Amino acid sequence: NSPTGQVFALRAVYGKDPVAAGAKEAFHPMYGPDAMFSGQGAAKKFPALAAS
Amino acid sequence: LLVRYALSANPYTVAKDEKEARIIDGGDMDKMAGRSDLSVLLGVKLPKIII
Amino acid sequence: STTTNSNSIGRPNLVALTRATTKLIYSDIVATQRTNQPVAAFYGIKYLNPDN
Amino acid sequence: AEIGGDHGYNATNIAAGQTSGAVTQIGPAVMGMVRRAIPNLIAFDICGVQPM
């Protein structure tokens, strides 16, 4: 009903800062939920696999 | 307590050195200094009050 | 810590309109009367002494 | 004679309402908001459910 309309999106993420680069989306259809953030992952820091 | 307000300047108050523009923000006093029309200031020089 | 920088505002509200019109003054400054023909004729009748 | 003008097809301009002709727009419309769907849960009846 008016030119140049708008539409919003509601990316839900987990992390201290929801706008920092690299934040992972919470309810992603392709990406499985990180089922350690609310669990043991809050107690320690698991290193990530890499090369060598 | 929290209070929020806009406190903008009135229209027809384009900022200097900009003149022609149509998104003019009448809130940034740093650019709106003096560039108003609906109000005029005039100071007065008077002898000091002794305290 | 979702601040106000996450939510993006939509259409700003239009609070006030501001037209510019002069205090037009001609009804009080002059004397008007509607003329019914493209030529308007006024009568000036003067009272004269025997020296005109 | 006062062309309507248009937005320069720049998301910078379109959101702010910066136009090219006259009567700069108040702002976009609001077509709605789309949020991510909620993943469904696998019923726990496959394994033992013993309320403690």
Swiss-Prot record, chain A:
A proteolytic cleavage by the prohead core protein protease gives rise to the mature major capsid protein during virus maturation. It comes from the Viruses. Homohexamer. Interacts with the portal protein. Interacts with the capsid vertex protein that forms pentamers. Interacts with hoc; one hoc molecule associates with each capsid hexamer. Interacts with soc; this interaction reinforces the capsid structure. A total of 960 subunits of the major capsid protein forms the 160 hexamers. Belongs to the Tevenvirinae major capsid protein family. Major capsid protein that self-associates to form hexamers, building most of the capsid in association with pentons made of the capsid vertex protein and one dodecamer of the portal protein. The major capsid protein self-associates to form 160 hexamers, building most of the T=13 laevo capsid. Folding of major capsid protein requires the assistance of two chaperones, the host chaperone groL acting with the phage encoded gp23-specific chaperone, gp31. The capsid also contains two nonessential outer capsid proteins, Hoc and Soc, which decorate the capsid surface. This is Major capsid protein. It comes from Enterobacteria phage T4 (Bacteriophage T4). The lineage of its organism: Viruses, Duplodnaviria, Heunggongvirae, Uroviricota, Caudoviricetes. The chain holds residues 118 to 169 of 521 of the full protein.
From Swiss-Prot, chain B:
Transmembrane segments: none annotated. Proteolytic cleavage at the N-terminus by the prohead core protein protease gives rise to the mature capsid vertex protein. Homopentamer. Interacts with the portal protein. Interacts with the major capsid protein that forms 160 hexamers. Belongs to the Tevenvirinae capsid vertex family. Capsid protein that self-associates to form pentons, building the capsid in association with hexamers of the major capsid protein and one dodecamer of the portal protein. The capsid vertex protein self-associates to form 11 pentons, building the T=13 laevo capsid in association with 160 hexamers of the major capsid protein. This is Capsid vertex protein. It comes from Enterobacteria phage T4. The chain holds residues 375 to 425 of 427 of the full protein.
